[PDB]
Amino acid sequence: MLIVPYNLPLPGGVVPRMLITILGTVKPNANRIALDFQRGNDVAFHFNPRFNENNRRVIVCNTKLDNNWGREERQSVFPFESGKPFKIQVLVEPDHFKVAVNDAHLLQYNHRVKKLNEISKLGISGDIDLTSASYTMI
Ligand SMILES: CO[C@@H]1O[C@H](CO)[C@H](O)[C@H](OC(=O)c2ccc(C)cc2)[C@@H]1OC(=O)c1ccc(C(F)(F)F)cc1[N+](=O)[O-]
Ligand SMILES: [Cl-]
Numbered sequence: 253m254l255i256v257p258y259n260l261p262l263p264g265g266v267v268p269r270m271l272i273t274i275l276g277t278v279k280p281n282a283n284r285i286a287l288d289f290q291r292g293n294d295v296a297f298h299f300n301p302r303f304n305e306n307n308r309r310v311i312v313c314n315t316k317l318d319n320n321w322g323r324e325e326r327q328s329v330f331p332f333e334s335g336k337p338f339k340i341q342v343l344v345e346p347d348h349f350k351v352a353v354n355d356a357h358l359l360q361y362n363h364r365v366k367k368l369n370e371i372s373k374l375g376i377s378g379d380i381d382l383t384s385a386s387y388t389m390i
């Protein structure tokens with residue numbers, strides 16, 4: 253497994269038609285996962301499966317600017333299961349990140365950070381065994 257937390261450099265940032273693929277397995281009794289697409293200290297796109305928020309499973313998406321979290325976007329569909337292998341695919345489109353999990357569309361997140369070519373790191377953290385993280389231009 254790769255060591256979590258794991259930083260994947262995104263050379264020259266992200267661009268439409270860039271597909272980021274994360275393969276891992278959820279640990280047993282997981283509490284959280286996080287993908288953080290970073291523009292220096294800012295978080296352009298935070299994707300945060302929470303396995304127990306007041307006894308519900310919810311995915312929280314948000315942006316952090318100058319250390320301030322913004323308005324959360326919340327999804328009720330929760331495709332992750334403790335102990336089970338997953339594939340997350342984040343496809344950069346012109347207006348949004350498009351996220352599929354296990355080949356099923358999950359959510360999109362509108363670009364709040366506009367300087368896509370400055371989102372040059374992906375942080376992968378939380379309660380996973382991380383198998384691989386890569387990108388390809390489609
Ligand atoms: C207002 O809460 C905040 O919301 C942000 C998104 O809008 C981030 O997710 C942010 O967390 C981080 O940035 C973060 C967290 C951990 C680490 C290691 C690094 C960075 C923080 O979340 C919690 O703290 C949170 C909110 C709810 C709950 C829940 F209720 F679900 F348990 C748990 C947490 N928990 O971070 O643990
Ligand atoms: Cl590693």
Ligand SMILES: [Cl-]
Pocket residue numbers: 364365366367
């Ligand atoms: Cl910007």
